[PDB]
Each structure stands twice: as C-alpha cells, then as structure tokens.
Ligand binder design. Structure first.
Ligand SMILES: *[C@@H]1O[C@H](CO)[C@@H](O[C@@H]2O[C@H](CO)[C@@H](O[C@@H]3O[C@H](CO[C@H]4O[C@H](CO)[C@@H](O)[C@H](O)[C@@H]4O)[C@@H](O)[C@H](O[C@H]4O[C@H](CO)[C@@H](O)[C@H](O)[C@@H]4O)[C@@H]3O)[C@H](O)[C@H]2NC(C)=O)[C@H](O)[C@H]1NC(C)=O
Ligand SMILES: *[C@@H]1O[C@H](CO)[C@@H](O[C@@H]2O[C@H](CO)[C@@H](O)[C@H](O)[C@H]2NC(C)=O)[C@H](O)[C@H]1NC(C)=O
Ligand SMILES: *[C@@H]1O[C@H](CO)[C@@H](O)[C@H](O)[C@H]1NC(C)=O
Ligand SMILES: *[C@@H]1O[C@H](CO)[C@@H](O)[C@H](O)[C@H]1NC(C)=O
Ligand SMILES: *[C@@H]1O[C@H](CO)[C@@H](O)[C@H](O)[C@H]1NC(C)=O
Ligand SMILES: *[C@@H]1O[C@H](CO)[C@@H](O)[C@H](O)[C@H]1NC(C)=O
Ligand SMILES: *[C@@H]1O[C@H](CO)[C@@H](O)[C@H](O)[C@H]1NC(C)=O
Ligand SMILES: *[C@@H]1O[C@H](CO)[C@@H](O)[C@H](O)[C@H]1NC(C)=O
Lengths: 436, 129, 129, 51
C-alpha cells in the first residue's frame, strides 16, 4: 500500500449514546408548568433525515422520562408552596347527612377567638376526604389528621397542562424514529435528527391515556415482552374515543377565618338537585376502537381469547379511572367500558389527593364555584394481564390498569433518543507534514 | 436528469457515506457543533470545557484553525493494513472510528510525545542557530 | 552504569534544575496544568478565565500554539547583565522568575505596545502594497 | 444498660422518641483502657517533654 500518515480531522459526524438534560421550551406567554423561565420555541424548526445511517431505539431506556418526572414534581411543589395549612381544621366534625350520602353537612367550634374573628362556620365535606370516628356518632375528621399536615392549594394556581417542548443542548442531538411499525425497541431504519421536540402536555391520569398522540393509521400495541406477566401493554389508538365529562352540581363556596390574617375556603351550599358526576362516552367510537385492538391482540394472544372484563386490582384510585377535569379530581368506574367481554360512567369526586404519591405534605383542592364541563378523548390506554392460566386460548383478561404515572410521558417519548456527538477524529493520508 | 438538494448536508447524514464524500461538509458539521437558570448555567460551563478541550489538543498538535491537518506521525499498519483507497473510498466515518477505536489514545499520545516534543525542541534550536 | 526513570518529569520537579534542562518538559508541564455542585461550578468558571487569559496574551504576542516563541523585543541589560550561558546553564526557573519579577509588567507591556503594534500596522501596509 | 424506647404522640402527624424502660441493673458508662499501653506511651512522651 501507500505509505500512510496520520491526519487529524475535525467535524467528524459520529456519535455515541449519552444521557443529559434537555432545555425546556414553551410558547411563551401561576400555572404549574407555565414557568417564568423557559426558552421560546422555534417558529421554523428543522428536521433532516440521515438515511445512510440507522439507529437502535429502545423506549424503555429513554431517561428523559426521569427528567420530566422530577422537574414536574418540583414545579408543582414550588407553585403551591405558600399555601394554607389545614392543621387547625383537624377539629372533629359533627356531621349529618346532607338532604337531597356522599356529602355531609357538619359543624365544629375552632379557633374560638384565638386573637381573631372566627366562628363554628358549618360547611359541606366529602366522604372521600374524611375518616370516620367509629367511637363517636359516627363523627368525622380530616383523613390527614393521623398522617401529615396538608395544605389547601393556592386559588391563584391553574392546573391546565402546558405543551412544553424540549430541545438539545450544545454538543448533543435528538434522533427520532419515524418507522410507523416501531414498537418497544429495534434498529429503526427511518431515523432523522430533530432540533427540538414538539410539546407534550403533562396529562396525569390512570387506566386511559387522554389528549395524546394517535397511532400511524392502525392500532399499535407495544410491550417489553408480551409473554411476561410483570410487564404492561401500551395501546396507541388509531383514532380517539370521544368523552364528555360534567359536574352538574352548581356549587358555591365560602371563605372562613381560621386565624389572624388567615383564610380557608369551604364548600358552600349547592344550588339545584345534587347529582352524580359522570362522563358520557360514545359507544360507537369505543366499540369500534376495541374491534381494532382485539384484532391486533389476536396476533400475540390467540384468535378466540376472551378479553376485557370489569375493573379490578389496586386501591380505589387504581381501580377507578382518574382525571382532573376543571381542577377537581374525578374517579370514575371504567367498568362500564369493560362490562362486557369479547356509555355513562358513574363517578365520585375527591379533594385530598396525592400527586402520583405524596409523603407527608399533600394537596387539598379548593372548592370550585359553579359547574365543571370539559371535553377530551381517549388516545391510548394501558392493559394489564390477570396472571397465570391455562395455556389454551380461552381467556386473557386485559383489565385496565397502571399506576406508574411515568408511563404518561414515556408513551410519547418512545419516538426520541439523545446522543453525544464527537467531532474529533483521525484517519490515514498519503503524505508527511512538511516539517522543518 | 438529476434532482438536487438545496445547498449542503443538513446534519450528520454523511456519517454513513464514505469518509471521502463526507469530508466535503466538515466545515458545515464543525460550525454546527461548535456553536432552570442554574441547570442551564451548569450546561453552559460544560459546553465551554468541551469546546476548549478540543481546542487545546488542536493547538498542541499544530492543527488549530484547520479542520484537516497532516501530522508527521507514520501510520503503523498493525492498526489497519488497508490501503488509502480501501479506507477512504470504501468506509464510513462511523465504521472507521470503530475499527481503530482502541488506538485513539495511542496515536494521540504519539502525536504529542513524539512530534510536538520534536517540533518544540527543534524550533528553539533553529531560532537560536 | 546508569539508572533511569520511566519516561519524563512527573510534575514540577524540574523547577529547581537549570532552566536549560527544565525546558525539556514544557510540553509535559503545560498539558498537565492546562487540563458542592455550585462551589465546583464557580471553580470551573474561574479555571476557564485563567485558561483563556493566558491564551489571550499568547494570541496577541504571536505565540499561540507555541510553548517557546521568540519575540522581537530586545533585552535591556539593566534588568540583568548576565550572559545567555550565565542564566540558562546556571539558574533555575524559580530563581530566575524572582530575579526579574519586577520587570514582568514592563516587558509584557513592551511586547504589546511596541512589537504587536508594529506587526499589525506594518502587516496591513504590506498587504495593501 | 439495655435500654428500650417509646414513640409518643406530640401533635397531629407528629411523634417524638422518649427513653423507655431499662432491662437489667442500671450501671455506669465506662471505658476500659490498657494501663500497660497507656503508661508506656506516657514514658515516651515524658522523654520528649524533657527536651
Ligand atoms: C383535553 O384538551 C381539551 C382541549 O384543550 C381540554 O378541554 C378544555 O379545557 C379548558 C381548561 O381551561 C377549558 O377552558 C375553560 O373554558 C371556560 C368556558 O369556556 C367557554 O369560554 C371560553 C372563554 O375564552 C372559550 O374559549 C371557550 O371556547 C368556551 O366558549 C372558561 O371560562 C375558562 O376560563 C376560566 O377558568 C380558568 C381556570 O383556570 C381561569 O383561569 C380563567 O381566568 C377563567 O376564570 C377556561 O378557559 C375548555 O373549555 C375545555 N374545552 C371544552 C370543550 O370544554 C380538556 O380538559 C383536556 N383533557 C385533559 C385530560 O387534560
Ligand atoms: C417489534 O418488536 C419485536 C419484538 O421485540 C422486534 O423483533 C426483535 O427485535 C430485536 C431488536 O434488537 C431483535 O434482537 C430480535 O431478534 C427481534 N425478534 C424477532 C423474532 O424478529 C421487532 O423488530 C419490532 N418491530 C419494529 C418495527 O421495531
Ligand atoms: C352533634 O350535635 C347533636 C345535637 O343534638 C349533639 O347531640 C351531639 O352530641 C353532637 N355531637 C358531637 C360530636 O358533639
Ligand atoms: C385506521 O383509521 C383509518 C381512518 O380512516 C381507517 O381508514 C383505517 O382502516 C384504520 N385502520 C385499521 C387497521 O382499520
Ligand atoms: C381529540 O381531542 C382534541 C381536542 O382539541 C381534538 O383537537 C382532536 O381532533 C381529537 N381527536 C380526534 C381523533 O377527534
Ligand atoms: C349557580 O346558581 C346561582 C343561583 O343564583 C346562579 O346565579 C349561578 O349562575 C349558577 N351557576 C352556574 C354555573 O350555573
Ligand atoms: C469494500 O468494498 C466491497 C466491494 O464489494 C464491499 O463488499 C465491502 O463491504 C466494502 N467495505 C465496506 C467497509 O463497506
Ligand atoms: C553560578 O555558578 C557558580 C559556580 O560556582 C555558583 O557558585 C553559583 O551559585 C551559580 N549561580 C546560581 C544561580 O546558582
């Protein structure tokens, strides 16, 4: 061969997988995710295809879901830091049934003029927020009394999800898998480089994925391993299913004095009949959606297998479907969607809630005045396998489930991978440097 | 008849084409790579350190200002016995870097310990006499 | 019979040997020197500023890329009347720097105000004509 | 002393640990130090102090 000599090159387009922090970006305008500090979005972002190069994607290793997990919780706690403690409101409640029982009409006597202007301030309380005192009437008190000090969320904080974007830092790039058939992992062929991702709204829910993206012209079902009962099945829907939710009760609210310079909002009277929360779901769209899902499930789980039975498994907040329409947390019985194996949902409202899990300090929602209405659609859902059974293709009871809230972002992040680019490299050449 | 793109390589695409063809856009790729508050502040400092690290080596090696510079270190064919054309017209940057990944520190050391050392010693001697 | 160390000066040891002998490992010493979260973050930024400060002067003086560069500023023997050999073969770096410590700012000024100024003015004039 | 301890309630969601009962005789804390090693150590110290 030729006498070869070392030549140094810079700008070499090669890279290695790496994990780092992506910068937030937002369509700039006390909403939790509406941080005062965030990069304005690019009105004309670029995307280029590699084509000579493929890349190994694995949605179960995208560490970006961890960044979102921690940052989102931090933003929640920060916005709701200067909020009102319920500590002096642990006073026992003399409760009777509210005439029309999920709502009790109770009284108490605290603080009784501890350098302030206060009184008994009777009010309405929800069953799901209190603990019975079986040694009394039965009487009630705040369920938090024997656990922790919790605060009433600041009335000035909105909880509307914001579609936050995330962009690569210098020296790093975001690769995207554009294969319509891409599942949990593999050598994605259609790979492109993206300057910055689209916005993902931090929607928090249990059992069904709401207001997300749609599948590429068919239902696509993903899992780490369809044979492993310890894994979950992620279903991305071809078209979404329409759901319309309402809180028909027109509620008032009252500010009460709890100390000098301190106020607390209580549920006031209710105007009109007291009715149940519920959501209306189109059976047509729901059933047709299921048809496509079943067809795909057959590919792995058998051609005559009975699927989709009633809700079961986990504590009440896992067994019920959960969402936060209007700022109030609704827990509805999804069984009405899965009450027939191979639509109006009854629903209750809770105010003392836990953002995915909370230790010690927790959030109590304020009462919302008026009526709550919203509209959304099911764009995905999580199925769980019921466990061991006869191998024969008889049953596989894909119950709704999933309590790991991180999957509400992983379900979108699966498209992306972050790498570190190494511009420095060498190769042989023909001649020696003309060294004197 | 030929269909054409606009101007030049978008970003990294050449990584899977031969190193010969890929060399055309080193100016593009280099420029693009070279160039809440606290987390970003940390990232900025890290970017600077990575930036300067590369500049340090390019300075020492006598390569500063160039994206292509010839050294005076001979190629030891033990690393790879491929000819010039067998590499440059037949192998990509991603593939090449892997082939000689385990010689990176070796050759980098040789550039500094042998050539740079020589160039600085002899330079002074030539300036003196 | 001679006993030998491995390869080269470990770190700073040459500081007490003659400047002549010590010059052998400028490549070593330079490389080594050149290259809870918040305190370290501060330190990193400071390191960068010190790094770049030296690079600024080396750039301006026309010395960038070199660890040994000849200037065009004459030595004023008022600073020291020792001959070349009386310094380089007889005095250490620690000792030398002390001898002319009070002329550092003077000579640095002269390099920029006189030579750099000349080189930039004359350069343009030569390029023009 | 083999001591027990008890968690007590001091407020809603608040606990405090108190010393509980003691099992066996209540004796003094103490340390055992080797007089040999100590004295020989002192010997060397004294020799240097003399300087
Ligand atoms: C999936 O995505 C859909 C669509 O984004 C969500 O549904 C919407 O949620 C927003 C939440 O704010 C609703 O917006 C509210 O509408 C109220 C009345 O709506 C009428 O009036 C507004 C006036 O601008 C019109 O834009 C609208 O079209 C209707 O004509 C407003 O009164 C609300 O503002 C008040 O409340 C907020 C509370 O934070 C205050 O800050 C304001 O100052 C003001 O007091 C608010 O704008 C919207 O109506 C919903 N759509 C529908 C059809 O109902 C789903 O919630 C989302 N699902 C999930 C799971 O996230
Ligand atoms: C859909 O998922 C299957 C199962 O994981 C993928 O097939 C496997 O891909 C991995 C990728 O490293 C290979 O190691 C396995 O050998 C593959 N298994 C078989 C039997 O082919 C499949 O590639 C995925 N489809 C897409 C489009 O990504
Ligand atoms: C609640 O009020 C009734 C009013 O008659 C009273 O008899 C009862 O003892 C009260 N309970 C409590 C908790 O004091
Ligand atoms: C997905 O939805 C489109 C909507 O038009 C439909 O035409 C298509 O048939 C659906 N895919 C499957 C697998 O049915
Ligand atoms: C789902 O709801 C959103 C709400 O804005 C709507 O824009 C979208 O078109 C809906 N998807 C389908 C498939 O109808
Ligand atoms: C609730 O009832 C009051 C009764 O006066 C009415 O003024 C108010 O508009 C009602 N609110 C809603 C949202 O219907
Ligand atoms: C070199 O060229 C031959 C031509 O057939 C090809 O088979 C081989 O894969 C090439 N090497 C590389 C690195 O692609
Ligand atoms: C210079 O050499 C003489 C030789 O005797 C020595 O005495 C003197 O100390 C030397 N100077 C230095 C700087 O050591």
């Amino acid at each position: 061969a030729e006498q070869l000599w070392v030549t140094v090159y810079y700008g070499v387009p090669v890279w290695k997988e790496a994990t780092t922090t992506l910068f937030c970006a937002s369509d700039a305008r006390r909403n939790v995710w509406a941080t005062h500090a965030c990069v304005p979005t690019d009105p004309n972002p670029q995307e280029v295809v590699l084509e000579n190069v493929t890349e190994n994607f694995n949605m179960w290793k995208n560490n970006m879901v961890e960044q979102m997990h921690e940052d989102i919780i931090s933003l929640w706690d920060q916005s709701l830091k200067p909020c009102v403690k319920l500590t002096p409101l642990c006073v026992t409640l003399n409760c009777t049934d509210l005439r029309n029982g999920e709502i009790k009409n109770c009284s108490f006597n605290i603080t009784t003029s501890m350098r302030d202007k206060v009184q008994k301030e009777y009010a309405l309380f929800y069953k799901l927020d209190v603990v019975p005192i079986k040694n009394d009437n039965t009487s009630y008190r705040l369920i938090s009394c024997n656990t922790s000090v919790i605060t009433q969320a600041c009335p000035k904080v909105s909880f509307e999800p914001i579609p936050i974007h995330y962009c690569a830092p210098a020296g790093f790039a975001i690769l995207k898998c554009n294969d319509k058939k891409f599942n949990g992992t593999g050598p994605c062929t259609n790979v492109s480089t993206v300057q910055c991702t689209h916005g993902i709204r931090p929607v928090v829910s249990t059992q069904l994925l709401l207001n997300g993206s749609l599948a590429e012209e068919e239902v696509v079902i993903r899992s780490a391993n369809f044979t492993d009962n310890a894994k979950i099945i992620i279903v991305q829907l071809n078209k979404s299913v329409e759901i319309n939710c309402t809180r028909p009760n027109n509620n008032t609210r009252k500010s009460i004095h709890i100390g000098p310079g301190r106020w607390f909002y209580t549920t006031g009277e209710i105007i009109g009949d007291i009715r149940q929360a519920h959501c209306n779901i189109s059976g047509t769209k729901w059933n047709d959606t299921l048809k496509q899902i079943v067809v795909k499930l057959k590919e792995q789980f058998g051609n005559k297998t009975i699927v989709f039975n009633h809700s079961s498994g986990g504590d009440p907040e896992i067994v019920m479907h959960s969402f936060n329409c209007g700022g109030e947390f609704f827990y509805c019985n999804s069984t009405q969607l899965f009450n027939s194996t191979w639509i109006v949902l009854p629903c209750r409202i809770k105010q003392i809630v836990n953002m995915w899990q909370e230790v010690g300090k927790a959030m109590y929602a304020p009462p919302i005045k008026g009526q709550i209405r919203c509209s959304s659609n099911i764009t995905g859902l999580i199925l769980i396998r019921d466990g061991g059974k006869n191998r024969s293709e008889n049953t596989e009871i894909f119950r709704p489930g999933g309590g790991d809230m991180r999957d509400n972002w992983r379900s979108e992040l699966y498209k992306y991978k972050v790498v570190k680019i190494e511009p420095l490299g060498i190769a042989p050449t023909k001649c020696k440097r003309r060294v004197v | 008849a030929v269909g054409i793109g606009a101007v030049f390589l978008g970003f990294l695409g050449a990584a899977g084409s031969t190193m010969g063809a890929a060399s055309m856009t080193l100016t593009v790729q280099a420029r693009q790579l070279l160039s809440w508050g606290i987390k970003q502040l940390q990232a900025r400092v890290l970017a600077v350190e990575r930036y300067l690290k590369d500049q340090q080596l390019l300075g020492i090696w006598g390569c500063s200002g160039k994206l292509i510079c010839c050294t005076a270190v001979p190629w030891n064919t033990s690393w790879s016995n491929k000819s010039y054309n067998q590499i440059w017209n037949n192998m990509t940057w991603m593939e090449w870097e892997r082939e000689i990944d385990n010689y990176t520190s070796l050759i980098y050391t040789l550039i500094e310990d042998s050539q740079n050392q020589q160039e600085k010693n002899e330079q002074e001697l030539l300036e003196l006499d």
